[PDB]
């Protein structure tokens, strides 16, 4: 019964983790922005 109370707390923690995973589904972005800036610099040099 004590472990079932702990499992209910762990189920609330799993619901919070599922909320965090759903928010995460919505470092690589900075590298993509740097590549876009390098492409913009190359386009400015071409212009």
């Amino acid at each position: 019964k004590k472990q079932i109370l702990q499992a209910k707390r762990i189920r609330k923690n799993r619901q919070e983790y599922d909320a965090l995973a759903k928010v995460i589904q919505h470092h690589e972005t900075l590298k993509e922005l740097e590549a876009l800036g390098k492409e913009l610099e190359h386009l400015s040099h071409i212009k």
Binding site: Q3, I4, Q6, A7
Partner: protein, 39 residues
């Protein structure tokens, strides 16, 4: 021979009763172990 047969029958009855009690206690312990494994 009669006393040996009576003692063997009494020992078999006690062994069957102890086996039934051990099976019931093992079923209760298995249910408790499954409840602990579920949580």
């Amino acid at each position: 021979k009669k006393l040996n047969r009576l003692a063997h029958i009494r020992l078999k009855k006690g062994r069957d009763q102890t086996h039934e009690a051990k099976q019931k206690v093992d079923a209760y312990h298995l249910q408790l172990q499954n409840l602990l494994y579920e949580v």
